[PDB]
Design a protein around this ligand. Structure first.
Ligand code: SF4
Ligand code: SF4
Ligand code: FES
Ligand SMILES: [Mg+2]
Ligand SMILES: [Zn+2]
Lengths: 48, 85, 96, 124, 689, 208, 114
């Protein structure tokens, strides 16, 4: 890398990271999609 | 005791429904005129025998076969249901 | 361009954020939630608009065979810029 | 060579659970042509498929889960009689849908320029 | 007589005037095509269907060339293969490299026919053509660089939809398809241009980028948005409804569906009822459990009985649910069973099916000579029926006459006033149209069921029955042709009438009930103002619109995409909807809810499974289990005789349809109101641009 | 030169056709059909009860010394009355040739075991029984070979689900591995791939 | 239509084979309980054998009966030879499966299953 530095981009991490398994910085998966079905919200005012 | 509705199931082409078909053709209007508020539903069967369902109060139903009947027989059987005997 | 939900949870670029009453937030306790800080929509908006003096231009994303399939954008509508939809790149004709 | 006056039935040999033998209604049908394409090569063989069951969302990663072994099972048959025979011998209930073929249509290019009829086209 | 032609040396007898393409179809060979659609006219400009005749030096356009006697059609000859390769080379020479970002993707005719009939390499070393994209509304997305100028959308627009706002401007390689102005192609039959476009130039905007054709699972069900009963295919993916597509049925649907059917599937993801709801001490709706909700409802059902129990059936209810609720209410001797739509019960009423059915089927319109529409707007009440009427008009010079408001249909018609006094004049014989009907060999009288909602619906029905009687007496008595017809606009109306529900809510208005079951009743016909104080309302349904806000107990049910059910369309045909996805949350099937309620209340119903419920349906009305059959018996004579004995006076009001404009078309039912795409369409057609 | 097209061997095609005629003449009682594919493979369709005579002839006859049983499998085709199609692949080292012999059977009809002609037929027929349910009459030891002990159902049949009906896990309460109904975290995503445009006209079937 | 019989010709010989197989299974349960160190009773094992025999009592085709007794002999020899483990023998008993409801109301409460 001293002889041939790599191409520099603004989105590339400035600080490298090792394997963070077994630490609070570990990766936890989740669903990245929103809720599929919207349920009806009943009126908050009384009736009858 | 309290009749609620009458249903007549007759196939439109089978020979066995010929008597029921004649009753519909030449006797239904007089029957309906006498019972304006009685639900008399005429429906269609495919390959089974004709039927006479009589729905009474509180969901009691009796089915009477009309297979190979005549127009007079259908009228008598129907008026027996209306009479109650 | 990360954003924070009212529950203190980061919002992903797809808008994902667990509800306040959602029980699934328990998985993040004593741990972290993986959110990428760079937002492609923000960066591509930050990109400028290239002005070319032709009715039709061609974009391959840069790099040639290392880009995307080459496509042609028609710069006739003067009320908006022509957008290459592979790379989201805007082009325009010199007005005035 | 023995003779049996019985209907063929292999449910006890297939190894299917009784739930999926009894409570399943397969559908024998010829698939409808996909309206997005004009080809008709997928509308030639009969298909047998099962009724849809529940699919829920996985709590982790949000994937679509299932508990029905026969959700992806689709069988191909050359004839309605063959499909019905297979369904009967395996014991599943079945609903048969008659094949729908387009009716022949009278097409004429010369009708686009009729002297007095409404078939004349205003554009080409 | 048939003439003998040969396809690859195989003999085949075809009628004179048959094209080469149809002869090859008869022998089982599908010739490649782009601009040919059997439902449209013959254009013959893409040149993809060129085939070689054995002795002809020149290839012929298979889609437009009629066959002659003793022709040998060489479908897979060297000349045919080279012609296909050349045409495909030109098309792909100018096409753009947009396949990965194209919604057509894996269901593209250009891709498939390129892979089957074209070459595998490109010789085009020049620059491509880029075309400016047009805007034609919120439903269709146009990326016109992908157009191959096949003129299918133009022919469809004009011929089928009666809208002449599509065409080609310019000439040469710069020829473009569009409106030439900022105009939105808004019509009730717009998505069919999305279907017929062979390339991705016209694509569905609500469906944009969501899925790919290979992922989706196809469920063959029917349509419930109107009373035509269109056959559809539901494209699901991971248990989610992704798309709605037409399914061919040449007697009902005929490959087309309306925009409401196609684009209102996204109302099934909003305002959904997912959990049972009761009312706490504050009077506010809160979630509860199935056991608790059904226990409260069954306690009320045990407390009250007789005519103090009513049920109102909505527009999206099915035969199984209807018969289960009917049996449950009959278990307590109650009979206040009603539908939220009015039909005249004077005379025959619902006793004879050939008094409220569309006796001349949809396919029977193509044979009629004269048609008279009374108090209806078929363009919005039944778009496919109106499309069939327009097709018959175009191809047979059918004479259409409309009595009442001059709505803008898609074809020229003879307008007759606005008032039923003209309807009485026609029956008397004073009107010239009486002579027209008498001289017509095949007349048809279609009375819109929206006209029967008036205070004088019985008088209108009697008048049109008298008109049909006069037609029958003057014209030929013999024949299987049927004149009298009724056009319905509600999916569940015919099934309810067959089961024995009393049409209209007049009985419930007459005798206010203590317990009211709103089974999908979102019309708002009966409200708490009419109901007595402290009336117990149970709304069972899938959308919270009106009945759910005003109800005491809320029971979530399943939609048509979510239950296997039976629906009867306006012509009396019965069709079964199949399950595509499952009900969300704690929602259940409607007849299952009713059966569980009966079991808790103690009046357990005699059916536990769908087959048993359909056996009960066969007991009440066997036509509900004879599915694809449409033939029935004709009792017009008895119906007319019963209608004559009681008559009233026609009101001095013009016949105004409920729907006069395309916005009124867009918003009609619960799913449509919950849909966001329908809201976008309404905004577009009101504010323009 | 046509570099992208497989060259054809008409000499071998003729030799295989001649030998097919030869065997069909020699064994008219059982042979129902003889075919030669265009990539030079001879295929013989026999009556199911001719397995032993046909195979013994093809092994012992001086002009057909098919001393090696290359393979033995079955194919499930539900649309047929006899769904199972038993295939024998034989290799003749003396004449440097290969032959195929195909018979048919259904669920309840046994096929005579060919362990008396070839010894590989033992495990091959055990596998056929295990995976398709086809029973072989005079088999020295017929039992499951590949499936789990007590496994119910024959997996390679077309009507058998891909994931089966049961799955295994260890249950701590009972301190042993248990079998429970199959339940998938992600359902197998079925893809409809077939194009609606006919690819090979040479194989087109009559419309009937 | 004459069909090739697997065994047993008519139904009586199939019933004879069924009785022989039942005796073989009945005399094997004590040895199976002893060898596999099962915690179940010998009476429980015999009852399970009886139940597994009774679920095929509706068969009227002698060939199907012959195939059933063939498979029964196979799974009996997997037990005498201790090829099976305690795992499979107890898989016969479904000791870990939760009891699925059978009445309409309970099935309605739990979910969408027919
Ligand atoms: S229309 Fe067809 S060929 Fe053109 S970009 Fe789309 S998928 Fe590709
Ligand atoms: S937009 Fe589509 S349907 Fe219209 S001419 Fe172009 S390719 Fe044909
Ligand atoms: S399909 Fe015939 S020229 Fe287009
Ligand atoms: Mg399209
Ligand atoms: Zn680009």
């Amino acid at each position: 890398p001293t002889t041939k530095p790599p191409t520099a981009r603004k989105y590339i991490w400035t600080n490298h990271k090792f394997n963070v398994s077994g630490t609070p910085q570990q990766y936890v998966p989740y669903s990245t999609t929103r809720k599929k079905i919207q349920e009806w919200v009943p009126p908050s005012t009384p009736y009858k | 005791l309290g009749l609620r509705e009458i249903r007549i199931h007759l196939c439109q082409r089978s020979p066995g429904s010929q008597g029921v078909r004649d009753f519909i053709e030449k006797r239904y209007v007089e029957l309906k005129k006498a019972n304006p508020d009685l639900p008399i539903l005429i429906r269609e069967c495919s390959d089974v025998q004709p039927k006479l369902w009589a729905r009474y109060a509180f969901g009691q139903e009796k089915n009477v076969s009309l297979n190979n009947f005549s127009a007079d027989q259908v009228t008598r059987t129907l008026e027996n249901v209306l009479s109650g005997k | 361009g990360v954003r924070t939900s009212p529950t203190g949870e980061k919002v992903t670029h797809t808008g994902q954020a667990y509800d306040d009453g959602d029980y699934r937030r328990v998985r993040f306790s004593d741990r972290q939630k993986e959110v990428n800080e760079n937002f492609a929509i923000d960066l591509i908006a930050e990109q400028p608009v290239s002005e070319v003096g032709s009715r039709v231009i061609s974009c391959d994303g840069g790099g040639g065979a290392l880009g995307h399939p080459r496509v042609y954008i028609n710069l006739d509508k003067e009320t908006k810029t022509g957008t290459c939809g592979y790379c989201g790149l805007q082009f325009r004709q010199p007005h005035h | 060579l023995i003779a049996v006056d019985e209907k063929l039935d292999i449910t006890t040999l297939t190894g299917v659970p009784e739930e999926h033998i009894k409570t399943r209604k397969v559908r024998i049908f010829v698939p409808a042509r996909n309206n997005m394409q004009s080809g008709v090569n997928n509308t030639k063989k009969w298909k047998m498929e099962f009724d849809t069951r529940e699919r829920w969302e996985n709590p982790l990663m949000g994937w679509s889960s299932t508990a029905d072994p026969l959700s992806n099972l689709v069988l191909t048959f050359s004839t309605k009689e063959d499909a019905v025979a297979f369904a009967e011998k395996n014991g599943w209930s079945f609903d048969v849908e008659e094949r729908k073929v387009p009716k022949p249509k009278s097409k004429s290019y010369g009708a686009n320029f009729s002297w007095n009829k409404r078939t004349r086209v205003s554009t080409k | 007589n048939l003439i003998e032609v040969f396809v690859d040396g195989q003999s085949v007898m075809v009628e004179p005037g048959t094209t080469v393409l149809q002869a090859c179809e008869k022998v089982g060979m599908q010739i490649p095509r782009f601009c040919y659609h059997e439902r449209l006219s013959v254009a013959g400009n893409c040149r993809m269907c060129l085939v070689e005749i054995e002795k002809a030096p020149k290839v012929v356009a298979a889609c437009a060339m009629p066959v002659m006697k003793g022709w040998n059609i060489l479908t897979n000859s060297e000349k045919s293969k080279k012609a296909r390769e050349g045409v495909m080379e030109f098309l792909l020479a100018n096409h753009p490299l947009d396949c990965p970002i194209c919604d057509q993707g894996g269901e593209c005719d250009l891709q498939d026919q390129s892979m089957m009939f074209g070459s595998d390499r490109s010789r085009f070393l020049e620059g491509k053509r880029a075309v400016e994209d047009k805007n034609i509304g919120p439903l269709v997305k146009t990326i016109m660089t992908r157009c191959i100028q096949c003129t299918r959308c133009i022919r469809f627009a004009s011929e089928i939809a009666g809208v002449d706002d599509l065409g080609t401007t310019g000439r040469g390689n710069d020829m473009q398809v569009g409106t030439y102005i900022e105009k939105m192609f808004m019509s009730e039959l717009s998505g069919n241009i999305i279907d017929i476009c062979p390339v991705g130039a016209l694509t569905s905007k609500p469906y944009a980028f969501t899925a790919r054709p290979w992922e989706t699972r196809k469920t063959e069900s029917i349509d419930v948005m109107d009373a035509v009963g269109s056959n559809i295919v539901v494209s699901t993916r991971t248990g989610e409804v992704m798309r709605i597509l037409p399914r061919m049925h040449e007697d009902i649907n005929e490959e087309w569906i309306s925009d409401k059917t196609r684009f209102a599937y996204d109302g099934l993801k909003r305002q959904r009822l997912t959990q049972p709801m009761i009312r706490n001490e504050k009077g506010l709706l809160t979630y509860t459990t199935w056991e608790d909700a059904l226990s409260r409802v069954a306690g009320m059902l045990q407390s009250f009985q007789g005519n103090d129990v009513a049920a109102i059936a909505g527009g999206l209810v099915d035969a199984e649910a209807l018969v289960a609720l009917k049996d449950l209410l009959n278990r307590v001797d109650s009979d206040s069973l009603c539908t939220e739509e009015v039909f005249p019960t004077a005379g025959a009423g619902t006793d004879l099916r050939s008094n409220y059915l569309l006796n001349t089927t949809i396919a029977g319109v193509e044979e009629a000579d004269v048609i008279l529409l009374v108090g209806t707007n078929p363009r919005f009440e039944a778009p496919l029926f109106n499309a069939r009427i327009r097709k018959s008009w175009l191809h047979n010079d059918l004479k259409v006459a409309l009595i009442g408001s001059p709505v803008d249909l898609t074809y020229r018609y003879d307008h007759l006033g606005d008032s039923p006094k003209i309807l009485q004049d026609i029956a008397s014989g004073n009107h010239p149209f009486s002579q027209i009907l008498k001289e017509a060999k095949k007349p048809m009288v279609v009375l819109g069921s929206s006209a029967l909602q008036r205070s004088d619906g019985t008088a209108i029905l009697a008048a049109v029955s008298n008109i049909a009687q006069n037609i029958r007496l003057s014209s030929g008595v013999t024949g299987d042709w049927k004149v009298m017809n009724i056009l319905h606009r509600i999916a569940s109306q015919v099934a309810a009438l067959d089961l024995g529900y009393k049409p209209g809510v007049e009985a419930i208005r007459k005798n206010p009930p203590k317990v009211l079951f709103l089974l999908g009743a979102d019309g708002g016909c009966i409200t708490r103002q009419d109901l007595p104080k402290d009336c117990f309302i149970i709304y069972q349904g899938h959308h919270g619109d009106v009945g759910a806000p005003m109800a005491d107990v809320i029971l979530p049910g399943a939609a048509y995409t979510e239950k296997s059910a039976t629906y009867v369309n306006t012509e009396g045909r019965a069709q079964q909807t199949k399950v595509a996805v499952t009900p969300p949350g704690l929602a259940r099937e409607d007849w299952k809810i009713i059966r569980a309620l009966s079991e808790i209340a103690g009046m357990t119903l005699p059916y536990d499974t769908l087959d048993q419920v359909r056996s009960r349906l066969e007991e009440v009305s066997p036509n509900l289990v004879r599915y694809d059959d449409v033939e029935g018996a004709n009792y017009f004579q008895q119906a007319n005789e019963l209608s004559k004995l009681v008559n009233q006076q026609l009101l001095a009001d013009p016949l105004v349809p409920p729907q006069l404009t395309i916005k009124d078309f867009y918003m009609t039912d619960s799913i449509s109101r919950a849909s966001q795409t329908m809201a976008k369409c309404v905004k577009a057609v009101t504010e323009g641009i | 030169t046509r570099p992208t097209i497989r060259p054809r061997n008409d000499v071998v095609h003729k030799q295989l056709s001649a030998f097919g005629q030869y065997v069909a003449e020699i064994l008219p009682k059982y042979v129902q059909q003889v075919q030669v594919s265009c990539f030079n493979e001879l295929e013989i369709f026999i009556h199911p009860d001719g397995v032993i005579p046909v195979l013994t002839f093809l092994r012992d006859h001086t002009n057909a010394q098919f001393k090696s049983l290359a393979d033995l499998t079955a194919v499930d085709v539900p649309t047929r009355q006899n769904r199972f199609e038993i295939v024998y692949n034989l290799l003749s080292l003396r004449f440097n040739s290969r032959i195929r012999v195909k018979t048919y059977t259904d669920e309840l009809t046994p096929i005579e075991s060919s362990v008396t002609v070839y010894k590989a037929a033992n495990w091959y027929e055990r596998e056929i029984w295990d995976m398709f349910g086809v029973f072989f009459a005079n088999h020295p030891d017929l039992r499951r070979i590949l499936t789990d002990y007590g496994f119910e159902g024959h997996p390679f049949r077309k009507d058998f689900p891909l994931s089966g009906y049961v799955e295994l896990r260890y249950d701590d309460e009972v301190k042993r591995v248990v079998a429970e109904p199959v339940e998938l975290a992600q359902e197998f995503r079925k893809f409809d791939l077939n194009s609606p445009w006919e690819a090979f006209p040479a194989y087109r079937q009559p419309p009937e | 239509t004459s069909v090739k019989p697997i065994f047993s010709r008519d139904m009586n010989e199939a019933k004879r084979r069924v009785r022989e197989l039942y005796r073989a299974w009945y005399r094997e349960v004590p040895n199976t309980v002893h060898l596999f160190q099962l915690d179940i009773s010998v009476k429980q094992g015999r009852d399970k054998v009886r139940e597994m025999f009774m679920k095929n009592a509706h068969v009227t085709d002698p060939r199907v009966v012959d195939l059933l007794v063939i498979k029964g002999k196979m799974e009996l020899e997997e037990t005498i030879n201790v090829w099976k483990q305690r795992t499979h023998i107890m898989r016969f008993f479904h000791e870990t499966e939760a009891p699925r409801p059978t009445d309409f109301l309970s099935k309605f409460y739990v979910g969408h299953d027919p």
